[PDB]
Amino acid sequence: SMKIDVVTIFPEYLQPVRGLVDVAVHDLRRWTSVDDSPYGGGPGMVMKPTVWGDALDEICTSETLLVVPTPAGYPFTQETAWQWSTEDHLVIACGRYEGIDQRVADDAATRMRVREVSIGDYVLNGGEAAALVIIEAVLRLVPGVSLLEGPSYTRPPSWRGMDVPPVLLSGDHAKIAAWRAEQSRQRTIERRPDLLGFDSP
Amino acid sequence: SMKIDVVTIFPEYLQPVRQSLPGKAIDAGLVDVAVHDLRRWTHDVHKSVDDSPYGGGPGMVMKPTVWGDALDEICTSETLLVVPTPAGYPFTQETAWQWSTEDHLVIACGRYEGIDQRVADDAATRMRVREVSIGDYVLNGGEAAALVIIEAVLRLVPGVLGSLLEGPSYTRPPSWRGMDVPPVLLSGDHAKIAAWRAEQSRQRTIERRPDLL
Ligand SMILES: N#Cc1c(N)n[nH]c1-c1ccc2c(Cl)cn(Cc3cccnc3)c2c1
Ligand SMILES: N#Cc1c(N)n[nH]c1-c1ccc2c(Cl)cn(Cc3cccnc3)c2c1
Numbered sequence: 001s002m003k004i005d006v007v008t009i010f011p012e013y014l015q016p017v018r019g020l021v022d023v024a025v026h027d028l029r030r031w032t033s034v035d036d037s038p039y040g041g042g043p044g045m046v047m048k049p050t051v052w053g054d055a056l057d058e059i060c061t062s063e064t065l066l067v068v069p070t071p072a073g074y075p076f077t078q079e080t081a082w083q084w085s086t087e088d089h090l091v092i093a094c095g096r097y098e099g100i101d102q103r104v105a106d107d108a109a110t111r112m113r114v115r116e117v118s119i120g121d122y123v124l125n126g127g128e129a130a131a132l133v134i135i136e137a138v139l140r141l142v143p144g145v146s147l148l149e150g151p152s153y154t155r156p157p158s159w160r161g162m163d164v165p166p167v168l169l170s171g172d173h174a175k176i177a178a179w180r181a182e183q184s185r186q187r188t189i190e191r192r193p194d195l196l197g198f199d200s201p
Numbered sequence: 202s203m204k205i206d207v208v209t210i211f212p213e214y215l216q217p218v219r220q221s222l223p224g225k226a227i228d229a230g231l232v233d234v235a236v237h238d239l240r241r242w243t244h245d246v247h248k249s250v251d252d253s254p255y256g257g258g259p260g261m262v263m264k265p266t267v268w269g270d271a272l273d274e275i276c277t278s279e280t281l282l283v284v285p286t287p288a289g290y291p292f293t294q295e296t297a298w299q300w301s302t303e304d305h306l307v308i309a310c311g312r313y314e315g316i317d318q319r320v321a322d323d324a325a326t327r328m329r330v331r332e333v334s335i336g337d338y339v340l341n342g343g344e345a346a347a348l349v350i351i352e353a354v355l356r357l358v359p360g361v362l363g364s365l366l367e368g369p370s371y372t373r374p375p376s377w378r379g380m381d382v383p384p385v386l387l388s389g390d391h392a393k394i395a396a397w398r399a400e401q402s403r404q405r406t407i408e409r410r411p412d413l414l
Contacts, residue, residue: 010221012217012220013217013220013221014217015216015217016213016214016215016216016217016344016345016348035372036372036373037372038370038371038372039371039372039373039375039382039386039387040371040385040386040387040394040398041391041394042370045372046370046371046372047372048372048373049372049374049377049378050374050377053377053378071366071367072366072367072368072405072409073409074409074410075336075337075410076336076338077336077337077338078337078338078339080338081338081339098370099367099370100370101370101371101372101377102369102370102371103371103377103378103380103382106380107377107378107380116409119335119336119338119349120291120292120293120335120336120349121291121293121294122292122293122294122296122297122335122349122353123294123297123353123356124349124352124353124356125221125352125356125362125363129345129348129349129352130349132345132348133335133336133338133340133345133346133349136340136341136345137338137339137340140339140340140341148287148288149286149287149288149314149315150288151315151318152254152255152262152314152315152316152317152318153254153255153256153262153317153318153319154251154252154253154254154255154261154262154263154264154265154317155252155253155255155264156265156266157255159265159266159269159317159319159323160269160319160323162319162322162323164255164319167256168255168256169255169256173257176256176257180256187288191288191289191290191291191332192290192291
């Protein structure tokens with residue numbers, strides 16, 4: 001059983017989320033201008049801590065795992081997803097602009113567990129798409145719901161003059177298992193050599 | 202000026218992308234994102250998109266004949282075909298920069314155990330195909346990855362959407378719940394501020410992403 005609360009100034013972006021789990025989306029502006037120029041200078045705007053503090057006060061408890069997407073976060077991995085899959089309560093704080101005043105996470109950490117995470121090494125305009133990814137990766141692991149996958153095939157056995165690998169039609173479990181291992185190994189070496197402890201291209 | 206076509210059995214999942222697009226960019230003809238229901242290209246009254254995996258195993262595999270027809274209609278020789286997959290090459294910021302100058306992206310979103318490999322292999326004989334993963338976690342299908350790719354790519358297209366880690370940011374008020382903004386930021390010593398931010402970045406990268414060093 002899990003409850004997920006998502007806080008965002010763009011609640012409409014979280015629509016694609018639509019009994020063991022409830023997901024609720026909250027408009028941050030309900031607790032109010034949410035942004036201002038950064039202290040110390042720099043381009044863009046920073047979300048003010050005041051509005052966030054009030055929102056999180058209401059939504060979070062000491063048992064909450066507060067998730068804060070950020071391009072500067074610890075990596076969110078499958079291990080993270082497994083870890084979070086047994087939590088009772090995730091709150092995902094989605095910001096925009098140049099980010100959220102750091103004191104929001106710092107203040108929250110005095111009261112609950114806080115995880116600043118990034119879903120990958122690319123830049124988004126805000127946390128919402130990251131929230132969608134995190135929710136999907138976590139929810140599919142909730143109780144009651146290494147190497148790269150090799151290629152998959154289905155009918156027909158010949159299509160546009162391209163044949164399904166004959167071993168897959170042979171019914172030889174051992175040969176099929178071995179061919180699939182080899183395919184995964186070749187794929188991992190080519191595409192993700194880091195997973196096998198080699199240099200990245 | 203970019204056209205993105207997304208093909209999916211859950212077109213409603215992609216609706217927020219068309220929400221995030223500013224009218225000015227669309228009206229200036231800088232961007233067009235169209236979403237297509239894969240079932241438009243099914244052959245049978247049951248609108249089947251999947252079938253059992255050759256060689257056995259759990260789950261199902263998306264049918265090559267359905268995808269083949271969809272991509273035949275939507276793609277041209279100039280298309281960059283993007284296929285999200287947990288077995289893909291990593292999608293990075295460098296990838297996003299590269300793709301941001303493309304005329305036509307087609308994103309093929311699958312489900313279940315994947316799309317019959319012959320779809321991408323056949324497509325690759327007449328267009329550029331890119332199998333990519335957005336990170337080291339497992340999703341149920343390509344749709345959430347497509348959302349991420351679209352956003353990361355389009356924000357690099359001039360006026361469409363509107364290394365070390367970045368350190369912390371602060372704004373008003375100067376004191377909040379017992380926490381003061383670091384005084385250096387209010388010092389007016391901008392060389393010192395830059396050095397402070399550099400050191401914050403270094404420390405954060407060591408703590409959170411040692412792999413980057
Ligand atoms: N998780 C993740 C993640 C990812 N993997 N990329 N971008 C994001 C993400 C997460 C949270 C925010 C917030 Cl709050 C504002 N922005 C825009 C921004 C901020 C600083 C520098 N550049 C862009 C966010 C980007
Ligand atoms: N991009 C990315 C990405 C990512 N970073 N995680 N998962 C995905 C993703 C992309 C595409 C598909 C398709 Cl098609 C089916 N599935 C579910 C699946 C397949 C094989 C093994 N397990 C789950 C997909 C998962």
